[PDB]
Design a protein around this ligand. Sequence first.
Ligand SMILES: Cc1ccc(C(=O)c2cc(O)c(O)c([N+](=O)[O-])c2)cc1
Ligand SMILES: Cc1ccc(C(=O)c2cc(O)c(O)c([N+](=O)[O-])c2)cc1
Ligand SMILES: Cc1ccc(C(=O)c2cc(O)c(O)c([N+](=O)[O-])c2)cc1
Ligand SMILES: Cc1ccc(C(=O)c2cc(O)c(O)c([N+](=O)[O-])c2)cc1
Ligand SMILES: Cc1ccc(C(=O)c2cc(O)c(O)c([N+](=O)[O-])c2)cc1
Ligand SMILES: Cc1ccc(C(=O)c2cc(O)c(O)c([N+](=O)[O-])c2)cc1
Ligand SMILES: [Ca+2]
Ligand SMILES: [Ca+2]
Ligand SMILES: [Ca+2]
Ligand SMILES: [Ca+2]
Lengths: 121, 121, 121, 121
Amino acid sequence: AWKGEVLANNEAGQVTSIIYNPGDVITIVAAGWASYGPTQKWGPQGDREHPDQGLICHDAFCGALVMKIGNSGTIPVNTGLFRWVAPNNVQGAITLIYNDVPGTYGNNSGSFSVNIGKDQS
Amino acid sequence: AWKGEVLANNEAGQVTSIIYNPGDVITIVAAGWASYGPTQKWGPQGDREHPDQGLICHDAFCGALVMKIGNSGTIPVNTGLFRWVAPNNVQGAITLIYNDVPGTYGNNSGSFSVNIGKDQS
Amino acid sequence: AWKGEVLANNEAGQVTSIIYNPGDVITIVAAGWASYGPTQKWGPQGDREHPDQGLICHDAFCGALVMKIGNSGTIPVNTGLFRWVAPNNVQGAITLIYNDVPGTYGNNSGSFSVNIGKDQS
Amino acid sequence: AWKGEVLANNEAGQVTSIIYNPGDVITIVAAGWASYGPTQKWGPQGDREHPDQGLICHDAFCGALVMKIGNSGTIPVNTGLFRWVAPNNVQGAITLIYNDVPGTYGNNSGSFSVNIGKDQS
Ligand SMILES: Cc1ccc(C(=O)c2cc(O)c(O)c([N+](=O)[O-])c2)cc1
Ligand SMILES: Cc1ccc(C(=O)c2cc(O)c(O)c([N+](=O)[O-])c2)cc1
Ligand SMILES: Cc1ccc(C(=O)c2cc(O)c(O)c([N+](=O)[O-])c2)cc1
Ligand SMILES: Cc1ccc(C(=O)c2cc(O)c(O)c([N+](=O)[O-])c2)cc1
Ligand SMILES: Cc1ccc(C(=O)c2cc(O)c(O)c([N+](=O)[O-])c2)cc1
Ligand SMILES: Cc1ccc(C(=O)c2cc(O)c(O)c([N+](=O)[O-])c2)cc1
Ligand SMILES: [Ca+2]
Ligand SMILES: [Ca+2]
Ligand SMILES: [Ca+2]
Ligand SMILES: [Ca+2]
């Protein structure tokens, strides 16, 4: 399995040790408190009240945890995924990213602690 | 595995199908939005700003997800637990509970969607 | 998980650390060479040519690996069990036993090397 | 997971649906009765009394179950593999094969029933 920190200010995202292959089943658990700028913190589901002003993922709130798998678009993670299977032709290294507007990561703070494992299949 | 809803207004908590036995390894993923009363919602980590005025679990925020295993005290769950093992002499049915002050559940709303599975061991 | 040897000459069998609980999924893999008395040795399926009379397990060949769960009757194991759930109401420690006629274990020789693990469930 | 039969008389072996990828943990359980020509049958460990000459796998007995991962050399399987990680740099489809001398498969008979699954990792 993989365990590590995803910094909210890391615009390129945190590459994991997990290479998602066809057929794989994965489980993700994400925890902790982070900010996209304000003097408040939100969990891995982000800020349900903040407008989307050009987020890297339009299917999750500002300040949410998302991922890319190889060459994929952003996929919501939020608090995690339980025994999850990717779409046809989605494969490669999993990168975890804090959901924010491109070029606005410099004022972000905090992190999420994330676990990923491959399940039985 | 078990999947189900934990209602924020359910003071007795939601009993699951998971009977935790000595040696078991479990994974929990919790998601969603709930309130302990106010016209705002919080995720399974609850409200980090709200004081503890007699919460059923003093190790988690008001509005967080917690659990009991058989005859145990409350144990924080928050967003989930990854490949977790219980203390010596903690065993029995897992019950999931919204963290609030006893007798104050009537104004709560929303729910968490929760998955629990037993891992390889 | 558990790994150990089951001696063919051990009439009482080898009690393991694995406690089979309701709902558990287990995998067993057994290997090696043993005899119920002749100079030949057989694997964990035993001797398909030997008559069935007086064996501790009528549903496996003489020289096969079998088990008990708690105080159950004998259950065939043979080369192993893949992601197995008990079809009967059984609970308790797994004991591994060589299948032979009671009182005839003293001329037996060799052993099986066995792995047991609990699977995801 | 994959379940199927490996015929002893099939020199090319049975290609499975399981693609072994770097880091995968697999479990294999094999059962049944087969012959490399004689009237006797043996289990998936084969015949411990048969000489080693000309077999497709020098590290297993004649009549044993072996495999290839992609275009690898033969790898012993015997009764199975418990939570196994490839110790060598191998990737690709698992092919299951009966261990015999090339060109001598036509007098073989019987089969092994095999389960393969990917384990948690
Ligand atoms: C149209 C517009 C106007 C103001 C901003 C803006 O200032 C801003 C700055 C951030 O650090 C930030 O994290 C976000 N966000 O999440 O939406 C917005 C961004 C876009
Ligand atoms: C000492 C005191 C004063 C006011 C209240 C109180 O009114 C209250 C009511 C709730 O529904 C509720 O969910 C909580 N809480 O989470 O703390 C407090 C509770 C205790
Ligand atoms: C050394 C040894 C140990 C066990 C056996 C053995 O299993 C055996 C011995 C007998 O006298 C017999 O009549 C039969 N039978 O009827 O199949 C089996 C045979 C030899
Ligand atoms: C009448 C009769 C027929 C078959 C057996 C018999 O099956 C048997 C099995 C053994 O493992 C064993 O060790 C021996 N023995 O050495 O005598 C006999 C035992 C008795
Ligand atoms: C029907 C059949 C099929 C295969 C065998 C067999 O494997 C065999 C045949 C031989 O002529 C021989 O010399 C040896 N050897 O040296 O061990 C083995 C024996 C019989
Ligand atoms: C010189 C020599 C010695 C041993 C073998 C031999 O091992 C063998 C193996 C077979 O599976 C088989 O089917 C046969 N056959 O029937 O001839 C022979 C083959 C050739
Ligand atoms: Ca920002
Ligand atoms: Ca309340
Ligand atoms: Ca005997
Ligand atoms: Ca042959």
